[PDB]
Design a protein around this nucleic acid. Structure first.
Length: 109
RNA sequence: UCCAAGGCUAAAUACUCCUGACUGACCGAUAGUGAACCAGUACCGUGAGGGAAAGGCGAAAAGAACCCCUGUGAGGGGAG
């Protein structure tokens, strides 16, 4: 089986979290946690939180051995965008997209 | 053919801010009132004035006790 965690609504662009996700996809839980704890990217704190939640789900709700677990699948999806107005010169306005993202992690043997 | 320089006179005619009953080969949320929603509101304008967007869990809240990750967060996974 595959155990899931979801981190819907992280205040960050999915394009940014995707670089973090690409490096932990398919790795063992230990190696992936190392990569996430020593990354300098903001998206790594979100990916690490979601991965830790998925590991705890697999250990508590399903009684799996987290020693044989691995990041079976991970992907980031776009969340809801907050729309803000940015004033510019000469009385002109721009729209600002404050993008959010959904992180889905599934761990399994 | 009819008697101005005195006055009057109902009905059949015009209408709908409204009340009641009833109707529709009228609309069904970008439609139909601008407005189904705390709308002539928010917002814009010194002002006269202009003028939006925005409905729906389920039959019944039975709206998820409790456990786990997390920062007593967000979010989720179980349980129900």
């Amino acid at each position: 089986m595959e155990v899931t965690a979801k981190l819907r609504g992280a205040a960050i662009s999915a394009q940014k979290v995707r670089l973090v996700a690409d490096e932990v996809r398919g790795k063992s839980i230990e190696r992936a946690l190392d990569i996430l704890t020593y990354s300098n990217k903001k998206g790594a704190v979100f990916v690490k939180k979601c991965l830790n939640s998925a590991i705890a789900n697999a250990e508590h709700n399903h009684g799996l051995d987290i020693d044989g677990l691995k990041v079976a699948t991970i992907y980031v999806d776009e969340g809801i965008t907050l729309k803000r107005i940015l004033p510019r010169a000469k009385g002109r306005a721009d729209r600002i997209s404050k993008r959010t993202c959904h992180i889905t992690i599934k761990v399994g043997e």
